[PDB]
Amino acid sequence: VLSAADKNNVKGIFTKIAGHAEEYGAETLERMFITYPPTKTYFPHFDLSHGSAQIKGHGKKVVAALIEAANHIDDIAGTLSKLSDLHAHKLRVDPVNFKLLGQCFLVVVAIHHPAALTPEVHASLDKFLCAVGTVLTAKYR
Amino acid sequence: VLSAADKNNVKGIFTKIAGHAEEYGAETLERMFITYPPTKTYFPHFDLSHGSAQIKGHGKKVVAALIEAANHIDDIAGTLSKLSDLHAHKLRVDPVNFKLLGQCFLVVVAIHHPAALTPEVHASLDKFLCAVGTVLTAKYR
Amino acid sequence: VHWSAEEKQLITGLWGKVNVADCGAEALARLLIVYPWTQRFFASFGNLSSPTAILGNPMVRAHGKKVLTSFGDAVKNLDNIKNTFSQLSELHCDKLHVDPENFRLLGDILIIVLAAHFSKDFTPECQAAWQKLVRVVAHALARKYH
Amino acid sequence: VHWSAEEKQLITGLWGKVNVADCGAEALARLLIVYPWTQRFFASFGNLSSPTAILGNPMVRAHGKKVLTSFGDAVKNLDNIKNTFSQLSELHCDKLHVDPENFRLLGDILIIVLAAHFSKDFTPECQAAWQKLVRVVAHALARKYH
Numbered sequence A, B: 001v002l003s004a005a006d007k008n009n010v011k012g013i014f015t016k017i018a019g020h021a022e023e024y025g026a027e028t029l030e031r032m033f034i035t036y037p038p039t040k041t042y043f044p045h046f047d048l049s050h051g052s053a054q055i056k057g058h059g060k061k062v063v064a065a066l067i068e069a070a071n072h073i074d075d076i077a078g079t080l081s082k083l084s085d086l087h088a089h090k091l092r093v094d095p096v097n098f099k100l101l102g103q104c105f106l107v108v109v110a111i112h113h114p115a116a117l118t119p120e121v122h123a124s125l126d127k128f129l130c131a132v133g134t135v136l137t138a139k140y141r
Numbered sequence C, D: 001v002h003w004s005a006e007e008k009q010l011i012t013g014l015w016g017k018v019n020v021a022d023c024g025a026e027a028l029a030r031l032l033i034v035y036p037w038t039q040r041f042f043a044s045f046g047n048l049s050s051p052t053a054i055l056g057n058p059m060v061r062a063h064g065k066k067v068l069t070s071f072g073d074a075v076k077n078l079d080n081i082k083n084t085f086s087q088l089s090e091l092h093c094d095k096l097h098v099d100p101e102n103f104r105l106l107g108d109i110l111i112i113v114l115a116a117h118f119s120k121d122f123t124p125e126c127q128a129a130w131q132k133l134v135r136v137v138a139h140a141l142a143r144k145y146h
């Protein structure tokens, strides 16, 4: 699973994101909603006009959930379990989408921290995100 | 993470799998190599003619690793840990192949015990074959 | 896609033995049971709240029948599978947003279902001939994304 | 696929500023360190037994260059993309057996390398277009498979 290098690389850039949750959160979702349109279908309650409260507010949520799985990293399922029931049983988020958000968040970090997102770091971060995608898809599996 | 139901649905069909490990796991391999011809790339040292001793002997091991994992179902990662050095590091399998085998094993069961392979059980067996793939690949990620 | 003459027969001969009604009901039922996420495409059918409600549902049964009847249009017309599925491509690809990975998951499921109903008749050759009709079908469905 | 005029003038503009060599070497450097199974298609390159090795590798570096030069053959002719990659479709699928998912995986990586290069210049709109292009190349490359 998440190796010493993984569990340290992933904290690496996540400590370099911090006072940037709301900013990095919302930019990921916008890139998601535009680079991939059909992902907006999960947000009809939502105003998806650029930099709108609910994108910014919930982007702030997503990262607080990303960064909080990065701190309680031994039990990644234990810290984000409540968002499995939600994403998997209630909202029936297709797994093909966690991939797509992953891509987007990764694109954020490589915009504001290119030097930080080295091949090695990219790779740990992929595993973590994909450890997260996998958890929130669990309310079947 | 498999539920309590998953584990009983999985133990059920597998208690019907034991006693036929060699012929089953040799069937799942041929149908793989024939319904999915590029997967023969990883067996270049094998005679993949019908019912050769290697397919039969490898087929035994695979399905035996499967039942060893089916039992120690709480720690699949711990029971199949060298199998991860083997498929991830040593052998380098596109992760897309484990899904290719898991599906071939699933046809094997539907052929041999249709009235055990019940939507509910089919659903559980797949989460399992899916956590098995994931562990044997989780020596990349 | 090229089709052998052995591939044709494996397909033509097997299709003529399918219970289209019962074959579709199960492949769609399980699609929903193994991939609960896909049910968000079928709230129109309502009760999919349990593996049994899905099996009990007349509209899920009825739909599966229709879905599989489609696969048959592919079996019928293996040279023309690209056009046969163009109007449905349009629907699944432009009106429904169905992620193409799901035509593969349906495909696989038929196989398992097709397995379940033929047993040893479903020879590895056959399975191969079909997974490959299933694969071509799922391609042709996604042709409106590219 | 039908392209936008805004889309073309976003691909076009962005391309003329990418280090096809640097940006080239680094998308394969990464395809191979974030997804190390793909090294099996690259034993000829030799030492791929560490990130560093993958990065310094003369042959990988020259490969990434050529893979990216290749995306640019698409940038140039977007209404002919599939014809352009037809001969490479025979190679990656018929002769190489690269699962088409890996084309997707190289694309997703090019995007991160390109995000890397330009940063903020690489806007959601630009990303979206460069995702689309990547999708269509990967698709013209798997065409042989279908």
Ligand code: HEM
Pocket: A039, A040, A042, A043, A045, A058, A061, A062, A063, A065, A066, A083, A087, A091, A093, A097, A098, A099, A101, A102, A129, A132, A133, A136
């Ligand atoms: C990295 C993976 C993801 C993380 C960490 C994450 C995080 C979260 C969190 C923490 C919430 C709770 C929001 C709240 O309490 O207001 C949430 C809700 C939600 N997420 Fe996810 N999410 C992820 C992936 C996705 C994906 C891929 C989609 C679909 C494209 C999605 C769609 C939604 C929707 C529709 C809600 C409810 C939003 C609302 O009603 O305000 N999420 N997510």
Ligand code: HEM
Pocket: B039, B042, B043, B058, B061, B062, B063, B065, B066, B083, B086, B087, B091, B093, B097, B098, B099, B101, B102, B129, B132, B133, B136
């Ligand atoms: C359910 C998932 C799988 C299980 C449980 C499994 C099981 C095993 C086991 C137990 C061995 C070691 C046997 C020994 O010590 O002789 C092995 C080796 C091997 N596996 Fe798998 N395997 C799985 C999936 C795959 C897949 C998807 C591929 C590629 C398509 C693959 C290709 C190989 C190869 C080439 C060997 C070399 C062993 C030999 O030399 O005979 N395996 N596997």
Ligand code: HEM
Pocket: C038, C041, C042, C044, C063, C066, C067, C068, C070, C071, C088, C092, C096, C098, C102, C103, C104, C106, C107, C137, C138, C141
């Ligand atoms: C390649 C496999 C598939 C084939 C051959 C197929 C074929 C069909 C057919 C024949 C119809 C009926 C047209 C009508 O009555 O309007 C249909 C409709 C539909 N399909 Fe599929 N389909 C496939 C995969 C999927 C998948 C995987 C999903 C969801 C994950 C899906 C979701 C739907 C929905 C929501 C409808 C409309 C249902 C309604 O409004 O009654 N399809 N498709």
Ligand code: HEM
Pocket: D038, D041, D042, D044, D063, D066, D067, D070, D071, D088, D092, D096, D098, D102, D103, D104, D106, D107, D137, D138, D141
């Ligand atoms: C989808 C984006 C891709 C593009 C545009 C692309 C393009 C190319 C090009 C231009 C060549 C030149 C062949 C030569 O110089 O001999 C090539 C060869 C090759 N490709 Fe790719 N490729 C892509 C994806 C992939 C992926 C994902 C893999 C495997 C993970 C792969 C494996 C190979 C291999 C093994 C060769 C031959 C290498 C050699 O013999 O030096 N390709 N490709």
